[PDB]
Scaffold this motif. Structure first.
Motif, PDB file in Angstrom:
ATOM      1  N   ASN A 159       0.807  -1.129  -0.027  1.00 25.10           N
ATOM      2  CA  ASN A 159      -0.069   0.024   0.050  1.00 25.10           C
ATOM      3  C   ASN A 159       0.972   1.298  -0.018  1.00 25.10           C
ATOM      4  O   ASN A 159       1.891   1.407  -0.588  1.00 25.10           O
ATOM      5  CB  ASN A 159      -0.870  -0.099   1.230  1.00 25.10           C
ATOM      6  N   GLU A 160       0.442   2.275   0.761  1.00 26.25           N
ATOM      7  CA  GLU A 160       1.383   3.715   0.448  1.00 26.25           C
ATOM      8  C   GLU A 160       2.610   3.548   1.145  1.00 26.25           C
ATOM      9  O   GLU A 160       3.713   4.142   0.405  1.00 26.25           O
ATOM     10  CB  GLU A 160       0.302   4.647   1.174  1.00 26.25           C
ATOM     11  N   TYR A 221      -3.869   3.784  -7.484  1.00 21.70           N
ATOM     12  CA  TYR A 221      -4.283   2.406  -7.555  1.00 21.70           C
ATOM     13  C   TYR A 221      -4.660   1.801  -6.106  1.00 21.70           C
ATOM     14  O   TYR A 221      -3.669   1.924  -5.261  1.00 21.70           O
ATOM     15  CB  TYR A 221      -3.359   1.475  -8.199  1.00 21.70           C
ATOM     16  N   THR A 222      -5.694   1.289  -5.821  1.00 15.26           N
ATOM     17  CA  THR A 222      -6.203   0.925  -4.522  1.00 15.26           C
ATOM     18  C   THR A 222      -6.404  -0.504  -4.454  1.00 15.26           C
ATOM     19  O   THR A 222      -6.966  -1.077  -3.346  1.00 15.26           O
ATOM     20  CB  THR A 222      -7.044   1.689  -3.738  1.00 15.26           C
ATOM     21  N   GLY A 223      -6.213  -1.322  -5.652  1.00 18.11           N
ATOM     22  CA  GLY A 223      -6.554  -2.854  -5.717  1.00 18.11           C
ATOM     23  C   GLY A 223      -5.482  -3.576  -5.070  1.00 18.11           C
ATOM     24  O   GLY A 223      -4.479  -2.781  -4.098  1.00 18.11           O
ATOM     25  N   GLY A 228      -0.573  -4.111  -3.471  1.00 10.37           N
ATOM     26  CA  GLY A 228      -1.464  -2.748  -3.216  1.00 10.37           C
ATOM     27  C   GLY A 228      -0.752  -1.781  -4.104  1.00 10.37           C
ATOM     28  O   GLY A 228      -0.912  -0.569  -3.957  1.00 10.37           O
ATOM     29  N   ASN A 233       1.894   3.125  -7.845  1.00  8.17           N
ATOM     30  CA  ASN A 233       1.664   4.504  -6.896  1.00  8.17           C
ATOM     31  C   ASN A 233       3.042   4.931  -6.458  1.00  8.17           C
ATOM     32  O   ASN A 233       2.981   6.278  -5.897  1.00  8.17           O
ATOM     33  CB  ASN A 233       0.959   4.236  -5.636  1.00  8.17           C
TER      34      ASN A 233
HETATM   35  C1  LIG Z   1      -2.189   2.394  -2.241  1.00 14.52           C
HETATM   36  C2  LIG Z   1      -3.148   1.675  -1.475  1.00 14.52           C
HETATM   37  C3  LIG Z   1      -3.561   0.370  -1.878  1.00 14.52           C
HETATM   38  C4  LIG Z   1      -4.662  -0.018  -1.008  1.00 14.52           C
HETATM   39  C5  LIG Z   1      -5.437  -1.252  -0.595  1.00 14.52           C
HETATM   40  N1  LIG Z   1      -4.608  -2.484  -1.287  1.00 14.52           N
HETATM   41  N2  LIG Z   1      -4.890   1.171  -0.032  1.00 14.52           N
HETATM   42  C6  LIG Z   1      -5.752   1.184   1.109  1.00 14.52           C
HETATM   43  N3  LIG Z   1      -4.100   1.994  -0.497  1.00 14.52           N
END
Ligand SMILES: Cc1cc(CN)n(C)n1
Ligand SMILES: Cc1cc(CNC(=O)O)n(C)n1
Ligand SMILES: [Ca+2]
Ligand SMILES: [Ca+2]
Ligand SMILES: [Ca+2]
Ligand SMILES: [Ca+2]
Ligand SMILES: [Zn+2]
Length: 316
Positions: A159-160, A221-223, A228, A233
């Protein structure tokens, strides 16, 4: 191993000749005793067992095709060591001159390279997507920078925080490429990616969207793919770093560039003093603002430019 320090000569993946620090004891080994507690390069022999065998050569000349990935992994690890020592006063990845170990010829047709928690690992590529990945100085420095991160901020690889981890490796990979001053640019992996296609790369920091990666937080992208989106990102942070250094106007927000050296100082201080394992993008902005304040003063252009760059990519 125990022996005497020697200097061999060979050719890297791109056909360039370079001298390499070796050690003689019956054979000449890819063991550079001139840097810290040593730089050691190993042959994985197309298998996945690591590290493999310390690279041994009968005559201290490394001009065979099979030698080229080892020459470059060894040499570029040395350049990366020199960058961290000379520019940031950091002695190897742990700050205490830890031995740097790399293995080449990992697996068969392997289109990647990585830091595995203990060492760097390089595939040879399949000859179409990649040639041997240690041919890219930015790739080598990217991988070793993961070791620096693991010993400092410890950014979790998801993620981030994982996108920041990736961007830190792209930033310092690129700053090492500029330090060596051989065809430097703000793209990642261009020297080893797609030998049949000129002018491309894995990622661009100056224009991440060139290769489909986001250049604004609203496009993140948040998948779940790619842990992640850590290699996706990262473009948001890479763009902010590029803007800090080189300046520009992005989504209507103008950034006054402050140069690569100050970018490196700000992000090195952020990485080693303020970032934590769970830092998100907003927390990275705060860490960079604080780092720039420490180094240049609260009213400095450097602080103002950090803020504009994060504004430009939508990170508050
Ligand atoms: C960049 C990102 C990806 C996700 C979920 N996999 N989140 C909450 N933020
Ligand atoms: C097996 C593997 C390959 C990669 C890409 N290397 C990198 O980003 O340094 N990772 C993270 N993991
Ligand atoms: Ca030889
Ligand atoms: Ca380049
Ligand atoms: Ca590059
Ligand atoms: Ca190419
Ligand atoms: Zn990486």
């Amino acid at each position: 191993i125990t022996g005497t320090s020697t200097v061999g000569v060979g050719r890297g993946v791109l056909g360039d000749q370079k001298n390499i620090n070796t050690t003689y004891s019956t054979y000449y080994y890819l063991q550079d005793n001139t840097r810290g507690n040593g730089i050691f390069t190993y042959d994985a022999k197309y298998r996945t067992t690591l590290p493999g065998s310390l690279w041994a050569d009968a005559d201290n000349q490394f001009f065979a095709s099979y030698d080229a990935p080892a020459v470059d992994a060894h040499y570029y690890a040395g350049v990366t060591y020199d960058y961290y020592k000379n520019v940031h006063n950091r002695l190897s990845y742990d700050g205490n001159n830890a031995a740097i170990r790399s293995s080449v010829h990992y697996s068969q047709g392997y289109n990647n390279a990585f830091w595995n928690g203990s060492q760097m690992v390089y595939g040879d590529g399949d000859g179409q997507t990649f040639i041997p990945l240690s041919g890219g100085i930015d790739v080598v420095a990217h991988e070793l920078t993961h070791a620096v991160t693991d010993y400092t901020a410890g950014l979790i690889y998801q993620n981030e925080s994982g996108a920041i981890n990736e961007a830190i490796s792209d930033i310092f990979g690129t700053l090492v490429e500029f330090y060596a001053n051989k065809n430097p640019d703000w793209e990642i992996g261009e020297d080893v990616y797609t030998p049949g296609i000129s002018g491309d790369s894995l990622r661009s920091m100056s224009d991440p969207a060139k290769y489909g990666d986001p250049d604004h937080y609203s496009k993140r992208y948040t998948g779940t793919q790619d842990n992640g989106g850590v290699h996706i990102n990262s473009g948001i942070i890479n763009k902010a770093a590029y803007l800090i250094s080189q300046g520009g106007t992005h989504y209507g927000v103008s950034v006054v560039g402050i140069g690569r050296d100050k970018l490196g100082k700000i992000f090195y201080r952020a990485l080693t003093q303020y970032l934590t394992p769970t830092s998100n993008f907003s927390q990275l902005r705060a860490a960079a603002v604080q780092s720039a304040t420490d180094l240049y003063g609260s009213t400095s252009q450097e602080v103002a430019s950090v803020k504009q760059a994060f504004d430009a990519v939508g990170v508050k």
